[PDB]
Amino acid sequence: SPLRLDRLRDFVSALGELLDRHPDEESVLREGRSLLGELVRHDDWLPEEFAQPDPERYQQYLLHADSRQRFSVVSFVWGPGQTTPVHDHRVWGLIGMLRGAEDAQSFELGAEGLRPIGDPVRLSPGQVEAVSPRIGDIHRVFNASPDQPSISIHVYGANIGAVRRAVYLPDGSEKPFISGYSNQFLPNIWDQS
Amino acid sequence: PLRLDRLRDFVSALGELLDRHPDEESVLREGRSLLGELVRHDDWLPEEFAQPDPERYQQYLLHADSRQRFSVVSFVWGPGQTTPVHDHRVWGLIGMLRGAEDAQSFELGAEGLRPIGDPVRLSPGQVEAVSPRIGDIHRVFNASPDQPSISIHVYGANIGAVRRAVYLPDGSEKPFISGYSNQFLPNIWDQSKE
Ligand SMILES: [Cl-]
Ligand SMILES: [Cl-]
Ligand SMILES: [Fe+3]
Ligand SMILES: [Fe+3]
Numbered sequence: 001s002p003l004r005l006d007r008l009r010d011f012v013s014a015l016g017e018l019l020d021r022h023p024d025e026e027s028v029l030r031e032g033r034s035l036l037g038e039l040v041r042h043d044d045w046l047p048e049e050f051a052q053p054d055p056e057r058y059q060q061y062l063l064h065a066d067s068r069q070r071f072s073v074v075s076f077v078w079g080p081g082q083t084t085p086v087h088d089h090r091v092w093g094l095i096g097m098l099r100g101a102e103d104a105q106s107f108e109l110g111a112e113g114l115r116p117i118g119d120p121v122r123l124s125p126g127q128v129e130a131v132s133p134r135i136g137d138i139h140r141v142f143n144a145s146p147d148q149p150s151i152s153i154h155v156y157g158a159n160i161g162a163v164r165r166a167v168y169l170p171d172g173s174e175k176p177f178i179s180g181y182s183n184q185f186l187p188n189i190w191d192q193s
Numbered sequence: 194p195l196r197l198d199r200l201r202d203f204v205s206a207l208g209e210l211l212d213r214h215p216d217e218e219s220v221l222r223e224g225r226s227l228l229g230e231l232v233r234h235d236d237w238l239p240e241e242f243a244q245p246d247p248e249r250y251q252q253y254l255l256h257a258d259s260r261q262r263f264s265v266v267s268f269v270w271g272p273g274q275t276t277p278v279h280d281h282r283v284w285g286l287i288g289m290l291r292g293a294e295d296a297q298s299f300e301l302g303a304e305g306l307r308p309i310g311d312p313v314r315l316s317p318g319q320v321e322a323v324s325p326r327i328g329d330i331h332r333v334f335n336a337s338p339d340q341p342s343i344s345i346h347v348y349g350a351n352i353g354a355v356r357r358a359v360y361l362p363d364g365s366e367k368p369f370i371s372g373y374s375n376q377f378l379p380n381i382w383d384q385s386k387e
Contacts, residue, residue, distance in 0.1 A: 016259035049377075065382040067208035067258045072382070162384040180385040185241075185377035190257040190264070192354040193372045 040096035053079035059182040083142035091157040097123035100150030107138040113172030232288035245271035251374040275334035283349040285323040289315035292342030305364030
């Protein structure tokens with residue numbers, strides 16, 4: 001069956017249109033999660049190259065970055081019982097669940113250190129959550145299945161791989177964090193023939 | 194070590210330029226300055242997107258804007274290869290990178306196609322322009338008979354998807370969609386590997 005890359009091309013174009021109306025963070029997340037919902041509902045477009053689990057670390061595959069680094073679209077792929085560290089973003093983010101099962105535990109900086117702010121959010125294909133400095137920026141995403149891999153498409157208000165942000169230890173101390181990317185090549189979504 | 198930052202900085206600068214909603218005259222003038230800065234140094238283009246094919250000239254997409262405002266393409270000619278006579282129907286900038294190639298501009302006359310001028314002889318660093326306004330029809334071809342030739346083309350669209358035309362000797366249009374030779378683009382956005 002032929003890969004429907006047009007889905008990703010159309011998402012990027014729509015998200016470009018959105019950010020050229022110079023909107024506020026409240027409106028970007030509200031309309032953005034609608035567009036990301038439309039993308040991750042169908043699992044027939046992500047090239048197999050950017051769905052591959054590594055057995056040592058979770059993989060971060062860049063799919064597209066805006067010319068002006070306004071935004072970026074990244075495929076995160078967790079192998080069985082893998083996890084991100086506790087981390088912030090320092091920009092608006094949208095996590096769209098695509099394949100498998102993973103949980104997102106939100107965190108807050110308290111006196112004692114890190115305190116989990118709420119119950120682990122349980123994501124199934126199609127579900128879209130948000131993160132930002134304004135609404136709650138610290139979390140930990142991890143694969144719920146112990147045998148299957150899990151994939152989600154993340155969208156950020158920057159080139160997320162180059163952002164100077166932080167991971168957090170139990171006592172609540174920051175360490176500098178630049179995530180980078182797992183791929184040396186992006187997919188060509190622009191050949192409409 | 195590949196200086197991909199050069200291409201990242203060009204794309205960002207060209208993004209800034211087009212968000213000031215400038216006229217075609219100003220885009221070409223400031224654009225050819227930025228493209229000049231890129232193609233003067235030949236230490237950034239990944240080898241994967243510099244490969245000649247022995248049958249047809251290769252068109253490798255390096256970057257496309259989110260809104261399809263512009264695209265940056267590596268064109269690679271093998272020995273004694275050539276494009277057909279073609280138009281663009283958008284503003285274009287051809288930056289010469291490696292080897293030697295000539296660009297013969299054309300005009301549609303009564304008899305058909307007549308070459309409008311002498312073949313423009315491009316050497317590494319040289320930047321020319323094309324558009325409907327200033328002269329849209331040309332033919333780019335490798336001047337060397339043994340070396341390959343490469344130039345970085347920048348267009349005011351996603352050039353591979355534009356419905357444009359090739360031209361035959363008698364001057365008759367055939368529809369033309371060029372597409373791209375590559376299934377993968379280079380990742381110019383991982384700054385943490387420097
Ligand atoms: Cl506390
Ligand atoms: Cl003409
Ligand atoms: Fe995150
Ligand atoms: Fe051309």
